[PDB]
Amino acid sequence: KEPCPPENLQLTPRALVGKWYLRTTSPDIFKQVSNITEFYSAHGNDYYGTVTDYSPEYGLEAHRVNLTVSGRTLKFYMNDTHEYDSKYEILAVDKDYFIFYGHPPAAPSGLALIHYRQSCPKEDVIKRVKKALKNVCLDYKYFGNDTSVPCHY
Ligand SMILES: *[C@@H]1O[C@H](CO)[C@@H](O[C@@H]2O[C@H](CO)[C@@H](O[C@@H]3O[C@H](CO)[C@@H](O)[C@H](O)[C@@H]3O)[C@H](O)[C@H]2NC(C)=O)[C@H](O)[C@H]1NC(C)=O
Ligand SMILES: *[C@@H]1O[C@H](CO)[C@@H](O[C@@H]2O[C@H](CO)[C@@H](O)[C@H](O)[C@H]2NC(C)=O)[C@H](O)[C@H]1NC(C)=O
Ligand SMILES: CCCCCCCC/C=C\CCCCCCCC(=O)O
Ligand SMILES: *[C@@H]1O[C@H](CO)[C@@H](O)[C@H](O)[C@H]1NC(C)=O
């Protein structure tokens, strides 16, 4: 579903620095790719870094990435495969998560992505994400999780 982005949400410089775990998406991408870890370094208002993931074809693999920021949107570019390259709009940003939405070749009718500071976010974080999604006209129940990552015994 297309979101209703906030009126004047700010994406602060360096908000995306460091390590994130891309654990929940709509539609669910996790039969195509899993165990997604992102690491971003600041370059001014932009970022560069690395995405690692488990590929059904290639196993654990790594890619260099660039994020080019303009206001509340950014351009995502990956070095060696381009199916996720798109403009993405920031929907929500928090100390513990961020959410963006774009239309890459992999999901051209729209792809919402939730990035977490924790590999297995605790319930308090998940509840805040639920609320943030409702505030942008989305609904957590229509997202899928990466069930390959062991978050429960
Ligand atoms: C899920 O993703 C995580 C994060 O990428 C994977 O953990 C990483 O696994 C690799 C391979 O075992 C580790 O690489 C090793 O790193 C050391 C030090 O740089 C190097 O000496 C070795 O030769 C090798 O490169 C890496 O450290 C490790 N990272 C963490 C934080 O544990 C994990 O394997 C993935 N799992 C699956 C099932 O996809
Ligand atoms: C895309 O980025 C990845 C990750 O940096 C590159 O992977 C490296 O490739 C070199 C050889 O070209 C190896 O010596 C490194 O060990 C690889 N690094 C990692 C972390 O896997 C990959 O080469 C890049 N691909 C292209 C086409 O630029
Ligand atoms: C902001 C977007 C975040 C995207 C992170 C998702 C991880 C993507 C990682 C690798 C994609 C590789 C897919 C290669 C498809 C090859 C096509 C084919 O031959 O079938
Ligand atoms: C994703 O995981 C959260 C946390 O365990 C859970 O509450 C939610 O129901 C999960 N989503 C699906 C579709 O299972």
Numbering used by the authors: 1 to 153
Task: Give the original sentences from the paper that presented this experimental model.
Complementary DNA analyses revealed 22 distinct but similar peptides encoded by milk genes with homology to the lipocalin family of lipid-binding proteins, which are referred to as lipocalin-like milk proteins or Lili-Mip in this article. The data revealed glycosylated proteins that adopt a lipocalin fold, bind lipids and organize to form a tightly packed crystalline lattice. Lili-Mip serves as a complete nutrient by providing all of the essential amino acids, carbohydrates from the attached glycans, and lipids through chaperoning linoleic and oleic acids. After ingestion by the embryos, its increasing concentration in the midgut facilitates the crystallization of Lili-Mip.
Surprisingly, these protein crystals diffracted to 1.2 Å resolution and we report the first structure of a naturally occurring and chemically unaltered, heterogeneous protein crystal grown in vivo at atomic resolution. A complete native data set was collected from a single crystal that diffracted to 1.2 Å resolution. c electron-density maps of the 1.2 Å resolution structure revealed densities for glycosylation at Asn35, Asn66, Asn79 and Asn145. At positions 35 and 79, one β-mannose (BMA) and two NAGs were identified. The NAG molecules are linked to one another and to the mannose molecules via β(1→4) glycosidic bond linkages. The crystallographic data concurred with the MS data for the presence of four N-linked glycosylation sites. Mass analysis of Lili-Mip crystals shows the presence of linoleic and oleic acids. In the crystal structure, we observed a long fatty-acid chain in the barrel that we surmise to be either linoleic acid or oleic acid. Residues Val51, Val65, Thr81, Ser86, Phe100 and Leu113 line the binding pocket and show multiple conformations, suggesting that both oleic acid-bound and linoleic acid-bound proteins co-exist in the crystal. We can conclude from these observations that the monomer obtained in each asymmetric unit is a space average from all of the sequences, i.e. the crystal is made from packing of proteins with multiple sequences.
